[PDB]
């Protein structure tokens, strides 16, 4: 509730509003002005992205508190990353990530 935080909140709100309104006004001016006259590999790579993005979120949570977790948290995240990498190795070796078979 300080002056600086509410100033940055207003600045961020104005940034978002003016940005989206600038894009909207660009499209409105473009439209108004001027005269008139599949393969399953894509699913596989998207699903792999989803799974590895959730595991990436776990690592996102870990990375911001490494010093507070100590070496025990390092061991747990090392087991996590090892399971993650074993899954990646399995996907590569079975041809799931091989785009040209």
């Amino acid at each position: 509730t300080s002056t600086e935080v509410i100033a940055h909140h207003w600045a961020f709100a104005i940034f978002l509003i003016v940005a989206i309104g600038l894009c909207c006004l660009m499209l409105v001016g473009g439209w108004f002005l001027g005269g008139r006259a599949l393969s399953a590999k894509f699913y596989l790579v998207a699903m792999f992205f989803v799974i590895f993005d959730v595991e990436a979120l776990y690592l996102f949570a870990w990375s911001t508190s490494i010093r507070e977790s100590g070496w025990v948290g390092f061991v747990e995240a090392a087991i996590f990353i090892f399971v993650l990498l074993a899954g990646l190795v399995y996907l590569v070796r079975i041809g799931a990530l091989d785009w040209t078979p």
Binding site: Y43, M47, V50, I51, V54, L57, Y58, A61
Partner: protein, 100 residues
């Protein structure tokens, strides 16, 4: 200053709407969409409850909830693709062979 009742009521409304979408829609894709709405609503309810108590356990339950949501959306869409490539039809009433 935001009541716990209002957040839980919002989560309940979203859960009920997702369940209705799961029931009334005959396309399997919209059934999966309703499932995603339901699991997101339950995760929102956990976040509301955790924010009320000032505990981090609500966001941890959210993280487990969206891990489940991602993995079961992957499985459900794989089964949807299999149904599409085996029948060329996403009608969920057509896949009803086993009956009492």
């Amino acid at each position: 200053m935001i009541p716990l009742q209002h957040g839980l009521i919002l989560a309940a409304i979203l859960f009920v709407l997702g369940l209705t979408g799961l029931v009334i829609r005959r396309n399997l894709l919209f059934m999966l969409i309703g499932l995603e709405i339901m699991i997101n609503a339950s995760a929102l309810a956990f976040v509301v409850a955790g924010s009320y108590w000032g505990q981090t356990d609500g966001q941890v339950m959210y993280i487990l909830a969206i891990s489940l949501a991602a993995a079961e959306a992957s499985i459900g869409l794989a089964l949807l693709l299999q149904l599409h490539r085996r029948r060329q039809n996403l009608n969920i009433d057509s896949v009803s062979e086993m009956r009492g």
